[PDB]
Write an enzyme that holds these catalytic residues in place. Structure first.
Site, PDB file in Angstrom:
ATOM      1  N   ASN A  46       0.831  -1.209   0.000  1.00  0.00           N
ATOM      2  CA  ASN A  46       0.000   0.000   0.000  1.00  0.00           C
ATOM      3  C   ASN A  46       0.868   1.262   0.000  1.00  0.00           C
ATOM      4  OD1 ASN A  46      -1.677  -1.947   2.333  1.00  0.00           O
ATOM      5  ND2 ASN A  46      -2.496  -1.576   0.282  1.00  0.00           N
ATOM      6  N   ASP A  52      -0.685  -5.921   1.860  1.00  0.00           N
ATOM      7  CA  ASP A  52      -1.853  -6.802   1.925  1.00  0.00           C
ATOM      8  C   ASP A  52      -1.449  -8.224   1.523  1.00  0.00           C
ATOM      9  OD1 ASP A  52      -3.537  -4.545   2.486  1.00  0.00           O
ATOM     10  OD2 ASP A  52      -3.340  -4.024   0.347  1.00  0.00           O
ATOM     11  N   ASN A  59      -4.400  -6.694   5.703  1.00  0.00           N
ATOM     12  CA  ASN A  59      -3.457  -5.584   5.782  1.00  0.00           C
ATOM     13  C   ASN A  59      -2.504  -5.727   6.953  1.00  0.00           C
ATOM     14  OD1 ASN A  59      -2.392  -2.996   6.682  1.00  0.00           O
ATOM     15  ND2 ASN A  59      -3.779  -1.994   5.237  1.00  0.00           N
ATOM     16  N   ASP A 101     -15.063  -5.559  13.317  1.00  0.00           N
ATOM     17  CA  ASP A 101     -14.412  -4.374  13.892  1.00  0.00           C
ATOM     18  C   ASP A 101     -15.328  -3.152  13.946  1.00  0.00           C
ATOM     19  OD1 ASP A 101     -14.440  -3.307  11.222  1.00  0.00           O
ATOM     20  OD2 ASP A 101     -12.365  -2.645  11.311  1.00  0.00           O
TER      21      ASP A 101
END
Ligand SMILES: [Cl-]
Ligand SMILES: [Cl-]
Ligand SMILES: [Cl-]
Ligand SMILES: [Cl-]
Ligand SMILES: [Cl-]
Ligand SMILES: [Cl-]
Ligand SMILES: [Cl-]
Ligand code: NA
Length: 129
Positions: A46, A52, A59, A101
Site C-alpha cells: 500500500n 496486503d 493488511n 471491527d
C-alpha cells in the site's frame, strides 16, 4: 494456490464465513476475486508501506506482522506470510475479526466498490454447497 471459484466457496463455507455477520457467502467470494483473483500467494504494497496478503488481502498495518510495517499493529497475532498458505484457515479467521471491527465488509475497499449492492449470490452460482 489459485483456488477455483466453487472450490473457494466450499472452503469458506466449511470455515463458517457463510452469512457471518449477515454477509452471505457470495460477498466473500466476490471480495476474494477482486482482492486476489483467488490466489493465496497474492501480495500488494500500500501507499503507506503496509502490505496486503493472501486471498483476502489482509493488511499488515493492523492485522498481521511482516517485520517491515513501522508503527503497525498485529491484531490477528500472526506472521503475514502465514496468510499465503494454500490453506485459508488463518485468512478466514482473521477476516472474522476484521468484519467484526465495526465497519463490516466495508473494511475491504474492493468489496465496497465492486461487490456491495450487486447480485453477489451470482458468485456461488452453479456451486455444490
Ligand atoms: Cl471466475
Ligand atoms: Cl512490522
Ligand atoms: Cl523490504
Ligand atoms: Cl497489536
Ligand atoms: Cl482451507
Ligand atoms: Cl455489518
Ligand atoms: Cl451469496
Ligand atoms: Na502489523
Amino acid at each position: 494456490k489459485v483456488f477455483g471459484r466453487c472450490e473457494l466457496a466450499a472452503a469458506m463455507k466449511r470455515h463458517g464465513l457463510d452469512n457471518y455477520r449477515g454477509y452471505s457467502l457470495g460477498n466473500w467470494v466476490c471480495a476474494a476475486k477482486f482482492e486476489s483473483n483467488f490466489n493465496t500467494q497474492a501480495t500488494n504494497r500500500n501507499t503507506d508501506g503496509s502490505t496486503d496478503y493472501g486471498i483476502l488481502q489482509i493488511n499488515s498495518r493492523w492485522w498481521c506482522n511482516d517485520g517491515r510495517t513501522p508503527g503497525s499493529r498485529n491484531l490477528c497475532n500472526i506472521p503475514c506470510s502465514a496468510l499465503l498458505s494454500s490453506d485459508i484457515t488463518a485468512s478466514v479467521n482473521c477476516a472474522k475479526k476484521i468484519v467484526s471491527d465495526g465497519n463490516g465488509m466495508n473494511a475491504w475497499v474492493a468489496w465496497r466498490n465492486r461487490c456491495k449492492g450487486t447480485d453477489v449470490q451470482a458468485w456461488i452460482r452453479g456451486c455444490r454447497l
